[PDB]
Amino acid sequence: MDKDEAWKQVEQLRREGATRIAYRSDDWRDLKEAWKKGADILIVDATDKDEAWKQVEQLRREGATEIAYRSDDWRDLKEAWKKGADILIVDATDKEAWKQVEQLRREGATRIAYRSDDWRDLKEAWKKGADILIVDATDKDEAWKQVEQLRREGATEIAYRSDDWRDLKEAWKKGADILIVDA
Ligand SMILES: [Cl-]
């Protein structure tokens, strides 16, 4: 439900090469339209696995990249990966989540992401195999401080979710390279 202001801010930074835009939507056609407008990561999160995997398959047919899929269950992520998803988002917002990362690593996945509101959780996931660390802490004030800590720890691919362009901009300044906006 993001306003156009959120996309507007990430678009300006994306054009300057200062960020990648990740876009989440429940409709693959909306994801395709976003890809054509310059979105770099398309997040499928349909809870129905049949629909979600169908959305991954259709985005692959369209040539869209990079396709992401989000789940709390490594098995769903592994199926999405087989069907065309490149970025596998372990959702730790309701936790164990670290074990999902470990199993995906055992399966051979090398573009694992992890979504959490706590930098210490994200740091552990990073050590265990997650390469994209998603700070999603809209219920926590100044969550870009979590970005700052992960940046000092040496993580190279930090993403940040907010519906407010001001928060997105500050997270970029603190070291986020992927900004997540929503339909
Ligand atoms: Cl600053």
Author numbering: 1 to 95, 97 to 184
What did the article's authors report about this structure?
Protein stability can be fine‐tuned by modifying different structural features such as hydrogen‐bond networks, salt bridges, hydrophobic cores, or disulfide bridges. Among these, stabilization by salt bridges is a major challenge in protein design and engineering since their stabilizing effects show a high dependence on the structural environment in the protein, and therefore are difficult to predict and model. In this work, we explore the effects on structure and stability of an introduced salt bridge cluster in the context of three different de novo TIM barrels. The results show that despite the similarities in protein fold, the salt bridge clusters differently influence the structural and stability properties of the de novo TIM barrel variants depending on the structural background where they are introduced.
The salt bridge variants exhibit similar thermostability in comparison with their parental designs but important differences in the conformational stability at 25°C can be observed such as a highly stabilizing effect for two of the proteins but a destabilizing effect to the third. Analysis of the formed geometries of the salt bridge cluster in the crystal structures show either highly ordered salt bridge clusters or only single salt bridges. Rosetta modeling of the salt bridge clusters results in a good prediction of the tendency on stability changes but not the geometries observed in the three‐dimensional structures.
